[PDB]
Amino acid sequence: GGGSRCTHLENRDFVTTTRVTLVLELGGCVTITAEGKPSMDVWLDAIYQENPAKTREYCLHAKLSDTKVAARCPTMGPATLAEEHQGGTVCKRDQSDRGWGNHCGLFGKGSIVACVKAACEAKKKATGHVYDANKIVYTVKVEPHTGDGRKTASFTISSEKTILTMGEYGDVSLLCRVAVDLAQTVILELDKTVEHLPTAWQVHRDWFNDLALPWKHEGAQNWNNAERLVEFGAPHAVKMDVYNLGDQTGVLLKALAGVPVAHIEGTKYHLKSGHVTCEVGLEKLKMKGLTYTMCDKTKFTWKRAPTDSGHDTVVMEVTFSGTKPCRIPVRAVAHGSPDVNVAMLITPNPTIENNGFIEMQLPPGDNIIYVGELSHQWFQK
């Protein structure tokens, strides 16, 4: 290998002195090049919190039960049910036409009230967790970009500095700072059912807090705003039906279309987006191969011929049949100028080790790459 992960990412930056200030975005990576120093790949691997605090939970499908209706005749005042002043109920007061044909002395509008008990169907809740800046962890990884190893530093708000040992390449120092409103960021999940849905979504707390659904805190007996999922039928003399507004999963998933899907790995809740600013100290970085002799120019073979890296750099792989380890002779000419070298190594000291990957920058136009006496025509766009 030798740092091939960065060579694959879409968001790749090159930073080319002792310190270097970089911004590390989740899903991106940075390659640091420095004269007389090995190249380093640095990236923000994760931003997560273990066991974040739960927020309120929402009901997606109400379980409606024990519907009761009371009526009073014209002049006889309001119709009442005990369930009007109880928790876990949804009530509606209305008026019905009354007369001699339904036990009233007068013809007119009489009071009618219908109440229903409202609970949540099993496995039909939407849950949330909120982040806390004092408990977030951010993982920064460093790997030598040599082409022949990966180290991890974990940071909090309180622990901003770390020194990583890059084996034989010396030491690298990292001073990282984190940067939106974490206490206003919620990670939303739905209870699992037979259908396949994403793991979770990251939403703004104010949006999560406005969902038109019944809600409660874990452990509460009843649901608040349960009327959101109840519909009352037209009143008859003494009868008024109560209906369900149905399963809200489709409603919620439609509103979540385009919202970023987040990941949960055990007790780790991952932020979908974010960045960290680092100071990378290269003063203790040393090159490996200050003792190795030049590779025999005639013993190379193209394993993978020169190809576009996707980042306006050229990548290749060579096989070596001579004495190992050795420092690889690499150069490139502008077609028509065989004397001047126009190759700018991203892998600065390519070395064949006992059991090869070279990356270079080139000026636009017709060029010829040389890995020893192994040659290849290359046009830089």
Next chain:
Amino acid sequence: GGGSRCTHLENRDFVTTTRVTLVLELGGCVTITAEGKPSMDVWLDAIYQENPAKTREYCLHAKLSDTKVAARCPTMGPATLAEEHQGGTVCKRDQSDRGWGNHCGLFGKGSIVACVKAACEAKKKATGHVYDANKIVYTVKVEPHTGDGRKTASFTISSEKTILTMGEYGDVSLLCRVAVDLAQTVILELDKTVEHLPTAWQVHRDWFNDLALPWKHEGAQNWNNAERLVEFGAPHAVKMDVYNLGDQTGVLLKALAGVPVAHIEGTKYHLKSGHVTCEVGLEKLKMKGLTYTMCDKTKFTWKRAPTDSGHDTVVMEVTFSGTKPCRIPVRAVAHGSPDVNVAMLITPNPTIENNGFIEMQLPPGDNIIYVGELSHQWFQK
């Protein structure tokens, strides 16, 4: 009894010559008064069709299965799956980043395709039936509005005339005509589940035909437009997940809020609204009690004293202790004028029968009602 149903309805008209042209609305009723003829209550009882034709059915919850993903490297053309040209599948073509780390010679975007089989979950269909003007039936009922019997006439487009026999009251002729676009009116139902929902709703066919859901005709193997309930995840090198958009019941019931709930009684599908225009012939109607002597003025008792009918008429009930049957003496004076009768009978020939209900119109102001020598003060608003 004696025609007390009409006295209870909110939509009540009075029509006061041999023929009479009326409009009969569903949920409404008409009282016909005619000099030297008994009063009649006429109403449109129902507009229905037995066994209407089924329309397309919609899926509310997709059952997703056998998800397969195929990928090709940059330059290697499109990724394909057999399921792309099959029925009962949902497919999405996309591009994924590829390189040496996932078996491609080049770095770049490679083609990726994901396919899923899409069926409907059991009891998760929305069905429709469409009306046909050539098969609609409309039921008109007639009942003597006497206060001491109900007859039904069924009409079609082909059979517009009928003669009903009102027992001793003679005969009544009816010539009825029907009147929106029936072939563009759909009655929508959802399959029954554990929750309580209305029986059905009456919708416009063009609205029913635009529902953004998978659809099919009964008996078809697959669903059309099944992609409406599928969501594809972000593509990785060779893997792309496929998710469900969830149960659409809540989506559909939200759109049906305020839409009129319709009724199904066996094989009868009832229209929620509609009217019929009738010609009612009264030429063969005769009064009953042309032989009965006057009731004894002193043998009445208020069973229910004068009360507002709700239709700017006065209703009451009397008990009689003398010789039966007899014609009830009824009158009313404007307070200050004991000579002049200001009572306008809606029950024109009130009769006490062997095992009583009187309805009158009155001019505004202070009045006194007399049922024999039984009296009652009445202020007309």
Next chain:
Amino acid sequence: ATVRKERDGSTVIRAEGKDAATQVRVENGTCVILATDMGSWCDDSLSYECVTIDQGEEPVDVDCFCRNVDGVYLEYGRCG
């Protein structure tokens, strides 16, 4: 259908789908059950007044009515 007298003087008729369009005897009166949407007894229930109709009156806008018995209520589940 089953009948039970509550401690508040009320009477509760518990009905199922079989009881549709039947007439039952409650104390020294009778009640007519005309509800069309009844099923087997459960939590998904509806409970309301089974209105007493005075002698010589026709019932209006009710699918449960009584004669010669006061304070009657109907309850039914909608399962099955």
Next chain:
Amino acid sequence: ATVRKERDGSTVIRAEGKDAATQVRVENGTCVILATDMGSWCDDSLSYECVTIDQGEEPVDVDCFCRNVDGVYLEYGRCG
């Protein structure tokens, strides 16, 4: 996990949740299964290419990879 050779020369590894972060032997090669969302076998399945990584290359953006064996596919249900 179970292995089966199809008539088209392909190989199908059928895995469950127990198979997460395991290495299996397929013909004269080995495959590493790293899918984290696996469950018991059913209709609610996912099937894709378990990509062969060339010698001296590190796998990138794959949760199933093989060495010294060609045309391998992974399939898993997501029930339980």
